Design a protein around this nucleic acid. Sequence first.
RNA 1: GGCCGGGAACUCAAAGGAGACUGCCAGUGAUAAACUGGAGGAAGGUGGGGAUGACGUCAAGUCAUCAUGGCCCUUACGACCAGGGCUACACACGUGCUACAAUGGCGCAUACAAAGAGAAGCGACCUCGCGAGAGCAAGCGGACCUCAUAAAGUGCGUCGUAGUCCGGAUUGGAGUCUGCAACUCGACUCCAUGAAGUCGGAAUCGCUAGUAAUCGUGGAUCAGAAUGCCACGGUGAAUACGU
Lengths: 114, 127, 100, 151, 79, 99
Amino acid sequence: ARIAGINIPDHKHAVIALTSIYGVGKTRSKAILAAAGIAEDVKISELSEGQIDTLRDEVAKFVVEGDLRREISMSIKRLMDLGCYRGLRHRRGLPVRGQRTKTNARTRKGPRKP
Amino acid sequence: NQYYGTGRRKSSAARVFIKPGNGKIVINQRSLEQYFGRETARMVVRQPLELVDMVEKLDLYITVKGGGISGQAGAIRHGITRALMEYDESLRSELRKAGFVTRDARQVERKKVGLRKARRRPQFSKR
Amino acid sequence: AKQSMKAREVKRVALADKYFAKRAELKAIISDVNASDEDRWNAVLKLQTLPRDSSPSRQRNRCRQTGRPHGFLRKFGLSRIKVREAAMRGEIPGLKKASW
Amino acid sequence: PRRRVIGQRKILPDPKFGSELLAKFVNILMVDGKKSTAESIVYSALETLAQRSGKSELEAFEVALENVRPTVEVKSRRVGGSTYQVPVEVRPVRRNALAMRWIVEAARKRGDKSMALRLANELSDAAENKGTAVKKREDVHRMAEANKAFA
Amino acid sequence: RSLKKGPFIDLHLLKKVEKAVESGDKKPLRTWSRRSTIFPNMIGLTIAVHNGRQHVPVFVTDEMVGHKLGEFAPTRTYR
Amino acid sequence: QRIRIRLKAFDHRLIDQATAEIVETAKRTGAQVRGPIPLPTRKERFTVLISPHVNKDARDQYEIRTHLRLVDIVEPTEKTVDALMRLDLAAGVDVQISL
RNA sequence: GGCCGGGAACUCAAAGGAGACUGCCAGUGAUAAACUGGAGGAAGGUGGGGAUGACGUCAAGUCAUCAUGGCCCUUACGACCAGGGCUACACACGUGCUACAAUGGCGCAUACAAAGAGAAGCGACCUCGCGAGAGCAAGCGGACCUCAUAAAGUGCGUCGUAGUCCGGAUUGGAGUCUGCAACUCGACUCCAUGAAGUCGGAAUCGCUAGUAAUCGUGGAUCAGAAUGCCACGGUGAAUACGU
């Protein structure tokens, strides 16, 4: 089913299926379903158009998908332009929250380069 | 009249009182099935009474504290053996040959300096 | 330790004894809820003009006989080396080697 | 060891039935001191196996073992700078031990859903003379036969 | 850092900023205090902040309000 | 009323001597007492390095034991209380009296 | 409900005693020292675990715990103060923690321990907050009060072999507490994000029994900062023909 501009699966339970949207986790999924009034263990293929429209109306109340992506990108761009310590770390590609760099740091650096 | 026994294993202690008639067992104000949910523990508790044919002739009142499940089961078995010897005094040979008369003196070994456990050493490298 | 470090410690303890009540009062004001919201600001600005060495957290425990800054035990007031020497000489009541 | 004699440890019989062979099987199957889990697995497997053949669980188990026990094996010797395989006879305790170990190792390698189902399938196949356990027995016997000159 | 305590600033820096604002113009204001928050009334000034050896000039804009002064004067050298 | 006595020491022979002394002084002044009750001993442990430099194994381990006793006097009198308060005992025993 | 009158039997607490010595039986052996087996007994042959380190070896380690012969500096190699560094980062090695899943992940509800610490301290009951916490306030220098609710286990549901309802690096936003002060450089909480990785090449390590493997709990240092170190208990194996 189409919800927020994307197709969500059909053979899963509602609570697991709704977590395919960029910005919805487990807590938000449970809250949305509680507001809409549907059980958490009902497959999406066993619903009706009114129920799906209710789900769309509920999901409209959060910031999801492209809006959230724009927010995050602008957040990082601000620091980079300001040129503080965190911005310099972000634009050199090193850890930002004070971790060690004599060893490790491979999630931010990539595989080893001889 | 009453016949008494004390039993011990790893860290547990058990008090056992036995009377004649109409086999029924009570442990800590509960039934055997309510207390022990393990078939191994039930079998361990019942072994001596199966060895001497008195399953349906004696009432058993028990208390126990300390340890786990297996330790408590063993302590109860020990206590029942002792109380039965007090009751009759001519079953000692059979019980001894079964092996229920011995106290099992296996305790936990202490940790030691320079080791990760009682006997486990850290990893060694030559270079 | 050098003779200057022990002097530093003595000075720190003296100042911290001198200024104890004032700091408690100011911190009570800052922490308490439902205050004027101006008294709070003034108290924050005043707590930082007192000497730094009056804070009990600038102190470091040292062995009472040598001044060592490492390996300190609170029950005895000494470091490990001096504790062992006294224990073997028989100068610490009730203490002896243990096994179990 | 060099100057030692080691006695035999005592093993309690099973609670449901009364065999020590079954207790040894449970022990060989257990991991990390979790005996209850292994007991549940074994009992479920024996139940699902007795229906498939209309006989007792112990009888089916013995029929499975008799197709995996070995008779001869090969040891490795090296005194002249070269390795030779020397055939030797197996004794009954080691026969039982090897059969049990091979059965469990084969069962763990399958691709069914649960361990109980895998174990039941392996035991039925062994009773029918099929599977990795029987193949292992055959390979061992072949290696023993190829080296009869060195007995 | 807890919100019920308010922001932190140094008294000498605060008084210097007040004098500079009232008197108007200002050549750089020299400071060793890297632990002070940036207040809205500093926008437009030049503060020279210690880094270990030198005093680095920082020209305050309104995108900085709420940060610590030290985040604009790096302390290590790497190439 | 009632008098409770608590005694502490690092040495059990010394503590037993003191307890017997207290019981005798109470019993010769015509007051019934409830004999001493042993209470659990406290074991405190320590562990130190024994080299002035690196070696990280090579430790020593020490202990201190504290022994404890309790005595109860049920029906005191003026003479008994004065006699108890007018007594001196060894130099390693701690005595606490509660009314 | 050990709740109240009581009881001194039992569990337990901590001080004096008893017990295990090849002591008894049979065989082997130099008319030996000893060895193999048996009875009784809680325990049998050093019953299990600690402490305890010969004459000496490596000009082994420590003048930075301390002490000390000989050199060396005294408006300086001796004092005081604020900021920074010991936390860097193309790279190579040692010791560990968490995983790669159905002997498992998630939800509900229900048994069973041992050993410790506590006055500038341990902080119950009650109210507020989704939570880290906050407010007001008993008790305890302690077999009495507090830290403090063991976890693996067991019963009932669901997931169905997928880089997944497996794993939890990294990053954005909003907060709490200690402390004059958390930018460089603290721990913890909520919402979102969801990387490598499907069992590891030539090498190579530990362990003979309440041991290995697996599960939780406590302390010293300490305003605050353990995946390290030192202690405690629960479940509980496989194998030893031989040199």
